[PDB]
From a paper:
pmcHuman [name] ([name]) is an enzyme that catalyzes the transfer of the δ-amino group from l-ornithine (l-Orn) to α-ketoglutarate (α-KG). As a pyridoxal-5′-phosphate (PLP)–dependent transaminase, [name] has a “Bi−Bi, Ping–Pong” kinetic mechanism. In the first half-reaction, PLP and l-Orn are converted to pyridoxamine phosphate (PMP) and l-glutamate-γ-semialdehyde (l-GSA). l-GSA is then prone to cyclize to Δ1-pyrroline-5-carboxylate (P5C). In the second half-reaction, [name] catalyzes the transfer of the amino group of PMP to an α-keto acid, preferentially α-KG, forming glutamate and regenerating the PLP form of the cofactor.
The structure of [name] crystal soaked with AVA revealed an intermediate that closely resembles the gem–diamine intermediate. Unlike other intermediates in a typical transamination reaction, the gem–diamine is an early intermediate in which the catalytic lysine, the PLP, and the substrate are covalently joined together, and the observed electron density can be fit convincingly to such an intermediate state. The carboxylate group of AVA formed a strong hydrogen bond (measured as 2.2 Å) with Tyr55 and indirectly interacted with Arg180 through hydrogen bonds via a water molecule, and the Glu235–Arg413 salt bridge remained intact. That this intermediate is observed in the crystal indicates that the lattice greatly modifies the magnitude and relative rates of the chemistry, in that no evidence for a gem–diamine species was observed for the same reaction in solution. Internal aldimine and gem–diamine were found anchored by the side chain of catalytic Lys292 tilting the pyridine ring of PLP. Thus, the observed AVA gem–diamine intermediate is likely resulted from a trapping effect during crystal soaking. To the best of our knowledge, this is the first experimentally observed gem–diamine structure among all [name] substrates. Of all chemical species present in crystallization condition, only the phosphate group of PLP possesses the right geometry to fit into the observed electron density. The electron density observed in the Ser186–Met201–Phe204 site likely represents a PLP bound only as a crystallographic artifact.
Residue numbers in the entry:
A (entry chain B), B (entry chain A): 37 to 439
The structure:
Amino acid sequence: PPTSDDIFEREYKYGAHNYHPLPVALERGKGIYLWDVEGRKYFDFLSSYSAVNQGHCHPKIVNALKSQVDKLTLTSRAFYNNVLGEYEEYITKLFNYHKVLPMNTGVEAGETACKLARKWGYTVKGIQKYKAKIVFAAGNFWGRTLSAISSSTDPTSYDGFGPFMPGFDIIPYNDLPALERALQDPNVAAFMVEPIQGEAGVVVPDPGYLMGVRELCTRHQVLFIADEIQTGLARTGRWLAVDYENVRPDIVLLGKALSGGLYPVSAVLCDDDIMLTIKPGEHGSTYGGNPLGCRVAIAALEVLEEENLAENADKLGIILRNELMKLPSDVVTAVRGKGLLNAIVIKETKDWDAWKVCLRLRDNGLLAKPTHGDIIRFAPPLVIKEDELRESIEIINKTILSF
Amino acid sequence: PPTSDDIFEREYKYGAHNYHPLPVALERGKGIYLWDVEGRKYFDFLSSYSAVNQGHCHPKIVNALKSQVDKLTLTSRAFYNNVLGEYEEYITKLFNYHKVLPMNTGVEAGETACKLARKWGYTVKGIQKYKAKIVFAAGNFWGRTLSAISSSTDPTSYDGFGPFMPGFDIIPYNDLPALERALQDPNVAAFMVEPIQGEAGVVVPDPGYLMGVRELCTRHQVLFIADEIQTGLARTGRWLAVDYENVRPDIVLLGKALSGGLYPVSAVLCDDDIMLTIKPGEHGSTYGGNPLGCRVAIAALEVLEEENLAENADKLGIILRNELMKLPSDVVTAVRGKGLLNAIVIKETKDWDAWKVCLRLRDNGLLAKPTHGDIIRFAPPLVIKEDELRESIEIINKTILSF
Ligand SMILES: *[C@H](NCCCCC(=O)O)c1c(COP(=O)(O)O)cnc(C)c1O
Ligand SMILES: *[C@H](NCCCCC(=O)O)c1c(COP(=O)(O)O)cnc(C)c1O
């Protein structure tokens, strides 16, 4: 039986070094808990970047996969499968959009959104071909494709990865005057923005920012693209993080928790006047819309609905942030977030940083990832209960004040 | 009980119109057979673009998925999981490369290969930053991302989709002189090519083109990237189509049959000097390398090995091409292919075409899809047997001569 150090050394020898994970080798997961190969038990306070909002191996999602895998898993889109239309009707009625375009990973949904915005910009808005612009916010993250890192302001994402995709403008985040200035270019076809910036360090914009984006985009006839791949599906306390200001984006991107972690499923939602600019043969994906991922996506959505995970994430997130703000200011310098998507800012020194705090948190039974050496994210599964949350808060307080 | 027509209209109402599939609504699949919602039984001669080489719902792959879904499905790569290193050692030793970078979809493996080539071009070869070029062959297909369509010579894939990715040069397929001409530029970092062009219509290059490409790339210090996402994993009669010419590419792209159609799993294989140009935090993906997909990948590869599907694809492919060449020259003008990846060219008129041939093949219990109005692909799962193949050949004969 391989030990933890045996697992690390194997991946180091046979796997690419594109990651430096926290040294812990998990083998089992259920609900909010993870178990390493030595049997130790941990609070999962990362949730695989909100991909297991429903908890690890939720039985209802597991049973949908097990039932469908015996029947049919992949026909490709050259033919019809019987499950896709069921999932399509369900999700478009749920979020109240005309249609959905199914993909697999989150960056594939973002690529589809950029392609929809350009095609709509040329064939509907009438922009001169191949001058269409898409505006992004600084600190944005929507994948690791060449196009995704082309709009990135993070040097680690784009440094050394070749000439970059043109047609992408970058403005500061949480800045309405900068968006107004950017939207003066009549070649702008879309503004793609996260309601909360996850990988940037759980950056929450000021109240009214989302209404301002919706108003500005409407006034200049520009597509409002909301990337809810991380913020959506009850993680911030609502079905969509844009529900906190009640704005209707033109294009909504879903993913991650869309399958509870059991299958790579993403989705792109918009109305007919945007969706139907793409004709047959002009876009798609091999596994996109396969019957297996559709069954787990139907079940993963039903778990969020019938277990009221959005409400639980809302009231539990207020407890988490309030308890975190009691830590001394000379240790944590900021606590922010919405619902169960939160982060703390560490007064980093030369000797003490967020990585060491996470190593000690692991020692005390709580797993979390640092995002920038002074930021630590706390995002547990939404099925957590108040007592389990308070137990984890005890682990956080003890670890933080033990330095 | 939704009927076949009901399934068509439901997807039309709530789903994007990016496809025009053959009108047949499948709900069950096993081995080489597919069943529609009315209970009719079909031969599958597309294999979901070689994604179910092992047949639909192979019990060994299904059992691997059913066993792992209850333990653990997704930790993200911020932590370690016990399954990934097992798959990494298995797939690297199997194909004889140092390391593997796991991704989900085929286009994501292509994007990863491009990022590896560029990072290798700047950090190892010494190209000034963002002058690196990647050469592609006309008629190529490797996904629908912005980067992917930026190298396509098919207008239906790049038309109306905005500014394109710089640094992508295109040369004619099956053209060694054009390749050396393109490689005279020292800023070229890689050449990505399919050993047999699938979506182009099963375009098999001349003998020696592969070892010539291998020789030209090595001479000019250029990375040879072989896209075996469709040609690899026994579909053409070998583990990799390049094995027919003993060619070892610098980077191999695998995908799609890598999971037997049960999960989106793709792989990027290369040695240390190429792979380790990407440092921790510089590339990744949420679902890339999750334990659930690694288990079904190990089982999918094991099925291909211990069932000798490459030898089976080699033998039966010879029979299939032999029988197909017995068709008259005024109806079928060309028959090409390696192993069980084959295609026929239809003497298309205004009267009849390949779509009507595939419609009537569907009527006679065999599913296949045309690729260009005059090309029809015949690619059944590699678990097919000779008598089952000959029954299908009879169906292919009687439909063609029925026009
Ligand atoms: C998901 N990214 C969250 C952090 C994961 C980093 C990593 O690469 O390991 C995310 C995406 C991309 O989704 P995929 O990783 O391609 O499935 C896009 N947009 C948002 C808001 C995300 O959180
Ligand atoms: C897979 N062939 C794509 C099948 C076309 C149907 C569709 O819906 O697009 C393939 C890829 C792309 O892999 P992914 O679709 O991204 O998983 C890349 N390269 C080759 C040679 C393929 O066969």
